[PDB]
Amino acid sequence: NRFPRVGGVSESTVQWEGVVFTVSNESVPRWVMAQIQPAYMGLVATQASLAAAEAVAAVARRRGIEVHGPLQVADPNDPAASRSQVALLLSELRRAGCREIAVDLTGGKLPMSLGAFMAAEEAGVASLYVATDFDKHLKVPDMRTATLRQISQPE
Amino acid sequence: FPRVGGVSESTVQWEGVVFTVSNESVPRWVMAQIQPAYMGLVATQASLAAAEAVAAVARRRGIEVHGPLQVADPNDPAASRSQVALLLSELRRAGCREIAVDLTGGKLPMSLGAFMAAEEAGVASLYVATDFDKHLKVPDMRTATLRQISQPE
RNA sequence: AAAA
């Protein structure tokens, strides 16, 4: 694809046994999946992004990842609703044996990312972010500049 | 310390509002609804022209504008926390009694550092929520509402 | 994904 083949800023950034996503599009989580190569995955989506989350899930299961979800949030503008569902996925992954989890909060609306961040921080799990440079008018990310970054390490 | 809650629209005419800035359209819409007396702006080298456009309009309405202050690294929440925290202090010291932070604009880590600075200062966080087209890529500004992300205690 |  037009994402770089290599994306992690550092070796620790790509070492995770599980990853939980807030989902808006299927492209970015699919790329992060290929960067990290986890054994487990969780997905939080909305009614509007459900189809894209189900496509990330189908891809991941085919490669043998244990995928929990997608779970839906009733309201993507409510960070509490996303915190609840991310916290449930974090707990499900742990009861399934996943020893080290990070939450990629790039996707979804901003309150979804904020709920995910709070759930991650309260659970002692790191948060990841795909950073890109943009066009002049800051409306479109350049996939070819993507880098995966850790923005918290509260473990 | 402010608690992160549900869906309620923010209905306070905040005396001061601090923005993280990416585009000029959304802050201008916020400023038109809230009509604050004070405004702070946090931008980047890339979003500076937009932030200065917001500032020019606000100043011509009589609003006291602090900033734009620039973040060196928009991918790093701590750089944005620091500048938002500076502007919160600046507005309070300039006489502003009730402040909110609108974290809609900027990259996600700029919003996240803004949020942390708002939580630390005990002030509310706001978000402009809109509905999008079917592919979730173009927001429809006609549907904009101002949401209160957190509730200061 | 600098307003999913």
Numbering used by the authors:
A (entry chain A): 52 to 206
B (entry chain B): 54 to 206
From the paper:
Prokaryotic type III CRISPR–Cas systems provide immunity against viruses and plasmids using CRISPR-associated Rossman fold (CARF) protein effectors. We studied WP_013033759 (hereafter named Cam1) from the halophilic Gram-negative chromatiaceae Nitrosococcus halophilus Nc4, which contains a CARF domain fused to a transmembrane domain that does not seem to be capable of degrading nucleic acids, as is the case for all the previously characterized CARF effectors. N. halophilus Cam1 (hereafter NhCam1) has a molecular mass of 22.3 kDa and contains 206 amino acids, with an N-terminal transmembrane helix (TMH) predicted to be 24 amino acids in length by deepTMHMM26 followed by an equally short linker (L1) and a C-terminal intracellular CARF domain. Here we investigated the structure and function of Cam1, a CARF effector that lacks a nuclease domain, but contains a TMH domain that promotes the formation of a tetrameric pore that is required to provide immunity through membrane depolarization and growth arrest of the infected cell (Supplementary Discussion).
We found that cA4 binds to the CARF domain of NhCam1 with a dissociation constant (Kd) of 12 nM and a stoichiometry of one ligand per CARF domain dimer (n = 0.5), whereas no binding is observed on addition of cA6, cA2 or cA3. By contrast, the 2.1 Å X-ray structure of NhCam1-CARF bound to cA4 shows that it adopts a dimeric fold with no domain swap between the monomers. Loop L2 adopts different conformations in each monomer of the NhCam1-CARF dimer in the complex, with the N and C termini being in close proximity in one monomer but far apart in the other monomer, owing to crystal packing forces. The bound cA4 is positioned over a platform generated from both monomers, and is further capped by a pair of L2 loops, thereby encapsulating the ligand. The bound cA4 complex is stabilized by hydrogen-bond interactions between N1 nitrogens of A2 and A4 and the Thr97 side chains of the CARF domain, hydrogen-bond interactions involving the backbone phosphates of bound cA4, as well as hydrophobic contacts between the adenosine rings and non-polar side chains of the CARF domain. The overall topology, hydrogen-bonding and hydrophobic interactions involving second messenger binding in NhCam1 show similarities with cA4-bound TsCard13, but not with TsCsm65 or SiCsx14. Alanine substitutions of amino acids involved in hydrogen bonds with cA4—T97A, S75A/N76A and Y180A/T183A—reduced ligand affinity from 17 nM to 3.74 µM, 4.0 µM and 4.5 µM, respectively. Triple alanine substitutions of amino acids involved in hydrophobic contacts with the ligand—K160A/F185A/L189A and V79A/P192A/M194A—resulted in a complete absence of ligand binding, and a reduction of binding affinity to 2.1 µM, respectively. Analysis of single alanine mutants showed that K160, F185 and L189 are all essential for NhCam1 function in vivo, and are therefore presumably important for cA4 binding during the type III-A immune response.
